[PDB]
């Protein structure tokens, strides 16, 4: 779900950046309410995420080549030998059905090599499950003697916004998703709107990203009146302030001049102490999934020589307790923890 | 719990396990941010589960978090509340902050739960209101007095401390003494509470409590204040805008 | 390089370029800093353990 | 009651008390040798 920025420099159109949207316009409230948002952490609305807000997909392509001069491995299935329920993932040709759900261990293709006289399969292996988007057979680098050995398979991996994923405004204010807060528990505006994204007010005094503050009242003014605003640098002056410009626009529309909104608590239901700073800010979802190195081991495999847990997250490997951790355990005088 | 690099023994402390349903990440309180030098910017932490009672006793009495309030480098605190809680406290302990019986009792039980062993009297004791007539009203500072009254032992007398604030008296108007933090027999009678009181700052209220009542009580006060300000920020939010 | 402008009202292009200089200057120092406390601590801890 | 307990690893604690805060002095000068180079000397 790509969206055109309300607040934008006119050069965005000059480079036709609308052909490739990089973000989405979100209702962002500068509020400290949940308690899970603080400095490097921001809150995303559950009901927004449920409605497809900031949803993304990731495509991965694999080349299955049979080269390792006489052809031995052939795409398909060998006669007389057939291990149970493989036909569920692959078609008669040995290639997978485009659209099929695959998990690690499932067969991604099938072949038969005469050297071993057995029907073998190339397994799909990744922590993330996928769906087959494209299967292309390529039989090149031959004049008359044609036979397929090379096949390109594209995987579609769906990526919903998860707790840990990074999100940022166009002002260098990045934060990890601390939680997907429910709309009933979310603070609700006088208008009846609950913010899509919650940014903590304690982020701004150190970063000094006032561009985001003026972007908030500009985006709100442009959403109401239905007009894009120019946010090209040095357009405004000390005498002609944007806070006054969009402030006048906000007052004309029927909202507070200083970009504030009277908001009510989602828990108590009572009106909050003061009016909360709410607006429309163009947010970007960063491609990285930070919890990729998530692991747990009780008693897994060990190396033959040291008889110590072997290295490897996916292999049920062990966490290293290095010299520094050894030093720290000596430090506490905690001899049994070291033991 | 371990956060690399382990430059000092406070970066490897003993934590009490709390299994949280429908979770995919390790949840950590803001008071631990300092000692581990861990910022929630996509940081990773190692969890070790010792397999015998001697190793258990050590992680609960020697390497445990509560026994790591003060660093051995300078003997100063490395434990305290960090952002929302500091802004919440300046508002909650302000003279202008008043609360009805219904509001007051809610803020007390919101942070102090006898069932979770937060109390020392097996019954939530409550102070009388500061305003009797016309309407019964409790001051913000009285919530801080009540939290201490229920977390500190009944056998010991109240805390006596004359500290200072980061916020000068001039900001609170004419003739205010709101910079002077005053605790007389465990009662906040003057001054608001800053980063200088329940932050990782020496000779504040939490540190003063740590010296008189011990590390277990100071830990209880930190968790209790941490909840109170989270609940207070939920009922009474805090924002920043162009007007500021 | 004296900037009379503020972040609320905005900064002029000359001031913007000068702010870019001073802003980057710090990040350059963080890139050119060979000094590390790793080996210094490792040498003390092994002799004082 | 403020006495150091017999068994306390004052050795590791000392090196950790010199090492850990010497990470805060990795930045350059704003004549004599300072920070980590002087500590190394």
């Amino acid at each position: 779900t790509g969206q055109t920025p309300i607040v934008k420099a006119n050069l965005y159109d000059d480079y036709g950046m609308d052909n490739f949207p990089n973000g989405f316009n979100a209702v962002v409230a500068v509020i400290s309410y949940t308690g899970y948002d603080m400095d490097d952490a921001m809150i995303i609305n559950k009901s927004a995420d449920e409605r497809g807000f900031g949803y993304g997909t990731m495509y991965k392509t694999e080349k299955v080549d049979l080269a390792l001069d006489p052809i031995t491995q052939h795409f398909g299935f060998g006669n007389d030998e057939w291990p149970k329920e493989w036909l569920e993932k692959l078609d008669e040709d040995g290639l997978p059905y485009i659209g099929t759900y695959v998990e690690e261990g499932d067969p991604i293709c099938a072949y038969f090599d005469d050297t071993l006289n057995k029907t073998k399969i190339k397994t799909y292996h990744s922590s993330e499950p996928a769906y087959i988007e494209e299967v292309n057979l390529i039989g090149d680098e031959s004049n008359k003697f044609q036979e397929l050995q090379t096949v390109s398979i594209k995987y579609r991996i769906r990526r919903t916004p998860q707790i840990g994923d990074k999100f940022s405004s166009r002002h260098g204010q990045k934060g990890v998703c601390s939680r997907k807060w429910p709309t009933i528990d979310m603070p609700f505006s006088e208008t009846g709107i609950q913010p899509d994204i919650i940014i903590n007010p304690h982020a701004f005094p150190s970063r000094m990203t006032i561009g985001m503050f003026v972007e908030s009242l500009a985006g709100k003014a442009g959403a109401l009146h239905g007009i894009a605003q120019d946010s090209t640098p040095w357009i405004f002056n000390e005498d002609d302030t944007p806070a006054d410009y969009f402030g006048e626009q906000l007052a004309k529309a029927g909202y507070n001049y200083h970009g504030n909104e009277p908001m009510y608590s989602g828990a108590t239901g009572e009106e909050l102490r003061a009016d909360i700073y709410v607006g429309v800010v163009y947010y970007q979802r960063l491609r990285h999934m930070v919890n990729d190195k998530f692991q747990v081991r009780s008693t897994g495999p060990v190396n033959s020589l040291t008889m110590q847990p072997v290295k490897g997250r996916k292999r049920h490997g062990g966490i290293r307790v290095g010299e520094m951790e050894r030093d720290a355990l000596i430090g506490h005088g905690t001899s049994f923890l070291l033991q | 719990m371990n956060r690399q690099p382990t430059l000092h023994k406070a970066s490897m402390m003993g934590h009490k396990v709390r299994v949280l349903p429908n979770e995919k990440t390790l949840r950590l309180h803001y008071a631990n941010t300092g000692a581990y030098n861990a910022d929630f910017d996509g940081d990773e932490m190692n969890m070790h589960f010792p397999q015998n009672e001697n190793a258990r006793a050590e992680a609960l009495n020697l390497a445990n978090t509560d026994s790591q309030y003060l660093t051995p480098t300078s003997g100063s605190p490395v434990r305290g509340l960090i952002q929302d809680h500091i802004s919440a406290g300046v508002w909650l302990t302000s003279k202008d902050s008043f609360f009805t019986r219904e509001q007051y009792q809610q803020y007390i039980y919101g942070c102090i739960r006898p069932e979770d062993g937060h109390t020392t009297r097996s019954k939530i004791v409550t102070l009388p209101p500061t305003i009797f007539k016309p309407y019964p009203l409790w001051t913000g500072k009285q919530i801080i007095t009540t939290v201490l009254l229920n977390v500190t032992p009944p056998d010991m007398p109240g805390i006596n401390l004359i500290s200072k604030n980061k916020i000068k008296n001039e900001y609170w108007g004419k003739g205010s003494l709101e910079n002077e933090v005053l605790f007389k027999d465990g009662a906040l009678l003057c001054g608001i509470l800053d980063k200088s009181q329940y932050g990782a700052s020496k000779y504040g209220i939490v540190h003063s409590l740590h010296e008189v009542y011990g590390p277990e009580v100071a830990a209880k006060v930190l968790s209790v204040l941490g909840r109170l300000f989270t609940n207070y920020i939920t009922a009474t939010a805090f924002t920043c805008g162009m007007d500021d | 390089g004296y900037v009379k402008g503020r972040f609320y009202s905005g900064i002029k292009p000359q001031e913007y370029y000068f702010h870019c200089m001073a802003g980057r200057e710090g990040l350059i120092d963080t890139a050119v800093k060979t000094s590390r406390s790793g080996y210094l601590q490792r040498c003390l801890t092994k002799q004082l353990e | 009651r403020s006495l150091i307990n017999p068994g306390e690893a004052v050795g590791i604690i000392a090196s950790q008390s010199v090492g850990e805060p010497s990470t805060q002095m990795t930045l350059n000068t704003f004549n004599v040798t300072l920070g980590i180079p002087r500590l190394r000397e």
Partner: peptide
């Protein structure tokens, strides 16, 4: 650069591969 340090479980303390290696390039 920080995305790689984020996952690596350290063997020991940082490393002296800087000025320290050239200072250690002197015999008694």
């Amino acid at each position: 650069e920080q995305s790689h340090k984020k996952t690596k479980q350290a063997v020991s303390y940082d490393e002296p591969d800087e000025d320290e290696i050239e200072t250690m390039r002197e015999a008694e």
